[PDB]
């Protein structure tokens, strides 16, 4: 079975087995690249990559995945896009859909990409919107499976620390619900995900055997976790509020799990080697913000495997929807 | 096969640089490449060729059409955007042309004066293709003529009658007039006299038309202009690199030439089709189109939503044909 | 004999024979492309081109060379958010190194590219930093060889006129010392290269048979030269008055006493009124052309477009040598 010709707009649109299939495909494509046996399933296909806001990481993952599979790409960056100011999205979708075989869109509201998905007539893939970051969560779930000693996703427990009211938190929560996982959102109540979405995901989790806990208590939130995940907190008010949710070595110890792994979608502020991270940390007497250098660079840290897996999972999305 | 040989290594700077039969050859070639692509039998004639795409203005259709065409034909591309170049600021176009010509096998240029692209064409040493200037947009019109043929069962171009409404002296108007003269068509340019093409260009086209059996009418009278037309064509009333303050004094002047359902009815032709080079301002789903239309109490500018989305509209077929026709130009001039 | 897996960060990192090898490979690749016999050694490789500062010239040479060799490229152009603002270079290098097979960097301090080179895990190539422009000098040396009536580099004498205190002057001086050449830096004393780099190059030149001369005297500086080289001079008002005596004009060519002397320039050049900037500057001083006159630039002595073409072939050599298989 396949997702041939589907769009990839948000994980809400997919079943448990369909998400698993994409992850399994990602693993097979990864192995094949490393083994030099990769079969080009997108040979002769042309893809357009529309970025209304810069996202070099997502961009590079799409380009490399396309190139590996025999496709060619057109990158349209923030200044290149005429959409919404000079040309409607409906018109733009119909035009691009005539010339290209598939289209990636990274932008603002989910409603924009849904309209592209409705009008383009070829597969449309969401590289990130305000609401959702579905490609990231695929990469994360693949990374979890690679680092969990054969535990399936439904047997995994993880915590996301800090500000969960944003695309990454939203997508982790949906993904966890879908896959029957036990997720804890650990952070200040004001920054828990949207109540409507939580309610929807709780409904999903009840059918899949998943669990969703929202808590301000770090000890309770991380106890027993296989993975700990965080992201940047964006600052005076936010830092003071978020500071207790910093992932440091003590937090790892509080899991009680010597095999705990640490994940971060990146970029991370973990030391004074960025302009911004130094500015903030100095103003606040910190060394690293959402995560400490010690944790970020430890053997528990799997962030660069997670980063690499952006590419393999985006490759799976394109192959599944557009490959032949 | 003189024709094919005679196209090799040419620049594609304006349709004034091509014969009737050459234009027909490129259109036919476009149709052949369109069929082959759909059939999955396309033979790559630009394998190993590298093409530079210089864009001094914004583009969606023309950029993507060059990229896709190049990719389909085995070529690779380097896109240099409006922030990327600055030509003439730090480096002369003569120098830039000579440098790019040593590295690349073909160059596309979209920008300002026709003189600039002609200088590029003179100095590069490889084929240079005009993807739009202030004065001309020749690839557009190849796509438009292919679309007209495809939507005129039986008819050749010399049998077709069409009207262009609006700003007749913009690049698209100019090119449509040239193209119609070259192909023996009956073209009406319908819009205010202040925006008619340059009298020297008109004279040149009228001379061409007399030998092909074409007809060129410039008129401010909508009914005389559209009566009997097979196709009605328009474009946005202010062009790129005109300043946005031009809208203020152009909308009211151009408003009588809006393509609405009533204009279609005035052709007297129930099978009239509508064309537009795109982008179009036909509703409130763009910030600029809403703001301008609202300033005049309009809904849609040069074309109404009703027309644009009707069964008479063939704009997305026209847009797709941008790629097949660009492909033809590159294959003819650089292919082997 | 190979450079497989090496970075190409600066000519200081290479031996005389390694530089010669790269130049010979550039020549071979050039001949192969013209002959239609090129063999693709980067087939299937993906390369990232990071340009923190624009250069359409260097960019196009990397792209075309990658394309000819079967590679695919991702061009990442200049923005408000530079490497090190939001993400460390160490993190960026590691991520890009997992996705790509090779990485070009053009940007700011040499330290940045050295860090990228240390962390990426794949070959890293310097397309220009504040300190060094190594790919340019390889192109220049190939061009010199091609236009030298049978002479090797060690046999060549050349002068660089004007402002030498910058990446091009620095690289030309290193390159010349490495290859045993006789280089004259001809210009006002305040614009000679960094004194520490001069000292280091004088030490290299002593091992290779090279010669480095710094002088303000044009006649003495250009006497006997096979090539004359310059670059743009733009504190715009004060520089131009200082630099004006070092304009390459026909009289300077004649002062070499060499009727076969050739003129080189890394480009872009201000040689007339057909650029906004060149016209704006020249007009203040009643000049037509700044560092070079139109007459010299467009003359039969000028080899600037051969030099420009050679940016591609030499960049191709660097990628093939380090990443090819
Ligand atoms: N991206 C665009 N606005 N394209 C329209 C191109 C044709 C139009 N007459 C122009 O020169 O502006
Ligand atoms: Cl990103
Ligand atoms: Cl999602
Ligand atoms: Cl034309
Ligand atoms: Cl160097």
mmCIF file with all atom_site columns, N, CA and C in Angstrom, chain A residues 277-307:
data_model
loop_
_atom_site.group_PDB
_atom_site.id
_atom_site.type_symbol
_atom_site.label_atom_id
_atom_site.label_alt_id
_atom_site.label_comp_id
_atom_site.label_asym_id
_atom_site.label_entity_id
_atom_site.label_seq_id
_atom_site.pdbx_PDB_ins_code
_atom_site.Cartn_x
_atom_site.Cartn_y
_atom_site.Cartn_z
_atom_site.occupancy
_atom_site.B_iso_or_equiv
_atom_site.pdbx_formal_charge
_atom_site.auth_seq_id
_atom_site.auth_comp_id
_atom_site.auth_asym_id
_atom_site.auth_atom_id
_atom_site.pdbx_PDB_model_num
ATOM 1  N N  . UNK A 1 277 ? 23.210 33.542 21.829 1.00 0.00 ? 277 UNK A N  1
ATOM 2  C CA . UNK A 1 277 ? 23.254 32.687 23.011 1.00 0.00 ? 277 UNK A CA 1
ATOM 3  C C  . UNK A 1 277 ? 24.183 33.305 24.061 1.00 0.00 ? 277 UNK A C  1
ATOM 4  N N  . UNK A 1 278 ? 25.270 33.892 23.632 1.00 0.00 ? 278 UNK A N  1
ATOM 5  C CA . UNK A 1 278 ? 26.159 34.611 24.566 1.00 0.00 ? 278 UNK A CA 1
ATOM 6  C C  . UNK A 1 278 ? 25.481 35.848 25.189 1.00 0.00 ? 278 UNK A C  1
ATOM 7  N N  . UNK A 1 279 ? 24.825 36.650 24.352 1.00 0.00 ? 279 UNK A N  1
ATOM 8  C CA . UNK A 1 279 ? 24.140 37.844 24.823 1.00 0.00 ? 279 UNK A CA 1
ATOM 9  C C  . UNK A 1 279 ? 23.168 37.489 25.919 1.00 0.00 ? 279 UNK A C  1
ATOM 10 N N  . UNK A 1 280 ? 22.391 36.446 25.689 1.00 0.00 ? 280 UNK A N  1
ATOM 11 C CA . UNK A 1 280 ? 21.286 36.125 26.636 1.00 0.00 ? 280 UNK A CA 1
ATOM 12 C C  . UNK A 1 280 ? 21.856 35.524 27.877 1.00 0.00 ? 280 UNK A C  1
ATOM 13 N N  . UNK A 1 281 ? 22.725 34.561 27.703 1.00 0.00 ? 281 UNK A N  1
ATOM 14 C CA . UNK A 1 281 ? 23.239 33.800 28.823 1.00 0.00 ? 281 UNK A CA 1
ATOM 15 C C  . UNK A 1 281 ? 24.010 34.722 29.763 1.00 0.00 ? 281 UNK A C  1
ATOM 16 N N  . UNK A 1 282 ? 24.792 35.636 29.196 1.00 0.00 ? 282 UNK A N  1
ATOM 17 C CA . UNK A 1 282 ? 25.508 36.661 29.992 1.00 0.00 ? 282 UNK A CA 1
ATOM 18 C C  . UNK A 1 282 ? 24.605 37.621 30.787 1.00 0.00 ? 282 UNK A C  1
ATOM 19 N N  . UNK A 1 283 ? 23.629 38.192 30.123 1.00 0.00 ? 283 UNK A N  1
ATOM 20 C CA . UNK A 1 283 ? 22.619 38.951 30.796 1.00 0.00 ? 283 UNK A CA 1
ATOM 21 C C  . UNK A 1 283 ? 21.942 38.199 31.994 1.00 0.00 ? 283 UNK A C  1
ATOM 22 N N  . UNK A 1 284 ? 21.817 36.876 31.897 1.00 0.00 ? 284 UNK A N  1
ATOM 23 C CA . UNK A 1 284 ? 21.098 36.012 32.856 1.00 0.00 ? 284 UNK A CA 1
ATOM 24 C C  . UNK A 1 284 ? 21.985 35.106 33.694 1.00 0.00 ? 284 UNK A C  1
ATOM 25 N N  . UNK A 1 285 ? 23.293 35.297 33.594 1.00 0.00 ? 285 UNK A N  1
ATOM 26 C CA . UNK A 1 285 ? 24.245 34.540 34.415 1.00 0.00 ? 285 UNK A CA 1
ATOM 27 C C  . UNK A 1 285 ? 24.191 33.044 34.143 1.00 0.00 ? 285 UNK A C  1
ATOM 28 N N  . UNK A 1 286 ? 23.870 32.680 32.903 1.00 0.00 ? 286 UNK A N  1
ATOM 29 C CA . UNK A 1 286 ? 23.764 31.268 32.463 1.00 0.00 ? 286 UNK A CA 1
ATOM 30 C C  . UNK A 1 286 ? 24.900 30.861 31.565 1.00 0.00 ? 286 UNK A C  1
ATOM 31 N N  . UNK A 1 287 ? 25.056 29.567 31.399 1.00 0.00 ? 287 UNK A N  1
ATOM 32 C CA . UNK A 1 287 ? 25.979 29.005 30.437 1.00 0.00 ? 287 UNK A CA 1
ATOM 33 C C  . UNK A 1 287 ? 25.096 28.020 29.695 1.00 0.00 ? 287 UNK A C  1
ATOM 34 N N  . UNK A 1 288 ? 24.586 28.427 28.557 1.00 0.00 ? 288 UNK A N  1
ATOM 35 C CA . UNK A 1 288 ? 23.602 27.574 27.846 1.00 0.00 ? 288 UNK A CA 1
ATOM 36 C C  . UNK A 1 288 ? 22.191 27.862 28.342 1.00 0.00 ? 288 UNK A C  1
ATOM 37 N N  . UNK A 1 289 ? 21.220 27.725 27.472 1.00 0.00 ? 289 UNK A N  1
ATOM 38 C CA . UNK A 1 289 ? 19.864 28.106 27.839 1.00 0.00 ? 289 UNK A CA 1
ATOM 39 C C  . UNK A 1 289 ? 18.994 26.861 28.050 1.00 0.00 ? 289 UNK A C  1
ATOM 40 N N  . UNK A 1 290 ? 18.306 26.416 26.997 1.00 0.00 ? 290 UNK A N  1
ATOM 41 C CA . UNK A 1 290 ? 17.440 25.231 27.119 1.00 0.00 ? 290 UNK A CA 1
ATOM 42 C C  . UNK A 1 290 ? 18.164 23.931 27.407 1.00 0.00 ? 290 UNK A C  1
ATOM 43 N N  . UNK A 1 291 ? 19.454 23.862 27.050 1.00 0.00 ? 291 UNK A N  1
ATOM 44 C CA . UNK A 1 291 ? 20.290 22.706 27.342 1.00 0.00 ? 291 UNK A CA 1
ATOM 45 C C  . UNK A 1 291 ? 21.713 23.153 27.631 1.00 0.00 ? 291 UNK A C  1
ATOM 46 N N  . UNK A 1 292 ? 22.396 22.423 28.504 1.00 0.00 ? 292 UNK A N  1
ATOM 47 C CA . UNK A 1 292 ? 23.809 22.689 28.835 1.00 0.00 ? 292 UNK A CA 1
ATOM 48 C C  . UNK A 1 292 ? 24.746 22.029 27.846 1.00 0.00 ? 292 UNK A C  1
ATOM 49 N N  . UNK A 1 293 ? 25.930 22.623 27.663 1.00 0.00 ? 293 UNK A N  1
ATOM 50 C CA . UNK A 1 293 ? 26.958 22.048 26.823 1.00 0.00 ? 293 UNK A CA 1
ATOM 51 C C  . UNK A 1 293 ? 27.260 20.603 27.203 1.00 0.00 ? 293 UNK A C  1
ATOM 52 N N  . UNK A 1 294 ? 27.367 20.377 28.508 1.00 0.00 ? 294 UNK A N  1
ATOM 53 C CA . UNK A 1 294 ? 27.668 19.060 28.968 1.00 0.00 ? 294 UNK A CA 1
ATOM 54 C C  . UNK A 1 294 ? 26.694 17.991 28.440 1.00 0.00 ? 294 UNK A C  1
ATOM 55 N N  . UNK A 1 295 ? 25.425 18.289 28.508 1.00 0.00 ? 295 UNK A N  1
ATOM 56 C CA . UNK A 1 295 ? 24.394 17.377 28.020 1.00 0.00 ? 295 UNK A CA 1
ATOM 57 C C  . UNK A 1 295 ? 24.437 17.324 26.485 1.00 0.00 ? 295 UNK A C  1
ATOM 58 N N  . UNK A 1 296 ? 24.535 18.494 25.856 1.00 0.00 ? 296 UNK A N  1
ATOM 59 C CA . UNK A 1 296 ? 24.460 18.572 24.390 1.00 0.00 ? 296 UNK A CA 1
ATOM 60 C C  . UNK A 1 296 ? 25.543 17.744 23.680 1.00 0.00 ? 296 UNK A C  1
ATOM 61 N N  . UNK A 1 297 ? 26.708 17.683 24.299 1.00 0.00 ? 297 UNK A N  1
ATOM 62 C CA . UNK A 1 297 ? 27.892 17.015 23.716 1.00 0.00 ? 297 UNK A CA 1
ATOM 63 C C  . UNK A 1 297 ? 28.131 15.631 24.325 1.00 0.00 ? 297 UNK A C  1
ATOM 64 N N  . UNK A 1 298 ? 27.285 15.205 25.239 1.00 0.00 ? 298 UNK A N  1
ATOM 65 C CA . UNK A 1 298 ? 27.567 13.916 25.912 1.00 0.00 ? 298 UNK A CA 1
ATOM 66 C C  . UNK A 1 298 ? 27.253 12.760 24.989 1.00 0.00 ? 298 UNK A C  1
ATOM 67 N N  . UNK A 1 299 ? 27.677 11.570 25.390 1.00 0.00 ? 299 UNK A N  1
ATOM 68 C CA . UNK A 1 299 ? 27.292 10.407 24.667 1.00 0.00 ? 299 UNK A CA 1
ATOM 69 C C  . UNK A 1 299 ? 25.748 10.157 24.671 1.00 0.00 ? 299 UNK A C  1
ATOM 70 N N  . UNK A 1 300 ? 24.990 10.777 25.579 1.00 0.00 ? 300 UNK A N  1
ATOM 71 C CA . UNK A 1 300 ? 23.506 10.645 25.600 1.00 0.00 ? 300 UNK A CA 1
ATOM 72 C C  . UNK A 1 300 ? 22.837 11.436 24.462 1.00 0.00 ? 300 UNK A C  1
ATOM 73 N N  . UNK A 1 301 ? 23.603 12.354 23.909 1.00 0.00 ? 301 UNK A N  1
ATOM 74 C CA . UNK A 1 301 ? 23.054 13.285 22.919 1.00 0.00 ? 301 UNK A CA 1
ATOM 75 C C  . UNK A 1 301 ? 23.045 12.665 21.560 1.00 0.00 ? 301 UNK A C  1
ATOM 76 N N  . UNK A 1 302 ? 21.884 12.634 20.930 1.00 0.00 ? 302 UNK A N  1
ATOM 77 C CA . UNK A 1 302 ? 21.725 12.075 19.596 1.00 0.00 ? 302 UNK A CA 1
ATOM 78 C C  . UNK A 1 302 ? 21.261 13.124 18.525 1.00 0.00 ? 302 UNK A C  1
ATOM 79 N N  . UNK A 1 303 ? 21.558 14.394 18.812 1.00 0.00 ? 303 UNK A N  1
ATOM 80 C CA . UNK A 1 303 ? 21.057 15.483 18.041 1.00 0.00 ? 303 UNK A CA 1
ATOM 81 C C  . UNK A 1 303 ? 21.574 15.476 16.616 1.00 0.00 ? 303 UNK A C  1
ATOM 82 N N  . UNK A 1 304 ? 22.782 14.972 16.381 1.00 0.00 ? 304 UNK A N  1
ATOM 83 C CA . UNK A 1 304 ? 23.288 15.021 14.972 1.00 0.00 ? 304 UNK A CA 1
ATOM 84 C C  . UNK A 1 304 ? 22.816 13.849 14.144 1.00 0.00 ? 304 UNK A C  1
ATOM 85 N N  . UNK A 1 305 ? 22.513 12.729 14.819 1.00 0.00 ? 305 UNK A N  1
ATOM 86 C CA . UNK A 1 305 ? 21.773 11.675 14.155 1.00 0.00 ? 305 UNK A CA 1
ATOM 87 C C  . UNK A 1 305 ? 20.346 12.141 13.797 1.00 0.00 ? 305 UNK A C  1
ATOM 88 N N  . UNK A 1 306 ? 19.716 12.856 14.706 1.00 0.00 ? 306 UNK A N  1
ATOM 89 C CA . UNK A 1 306 ? 18.385 13.435 14.477 1.00 0.00 ? 306 UNK A CA 1
ATOM 90 C C  . UNK A 1 306 ? 18.360 14.400 13.317 1.00 0.00 ? 306 UNK A C  1
ATOM 91 N N  . UNK A 1 307 ? 19.383 15.255 13.281 1.00 0.00 ? 307 UNK A N  1
ATOM 92 C CA . UNK A 1 307 ? 19.560 16.145 12.164 1.00 0.00 ? 307 UNK A CA 1
ATOM 93 C C  . UNK A 1 307 ? 19.747 15.474 10.794 1.00 0.00 ? 307 UNK A C  1
#
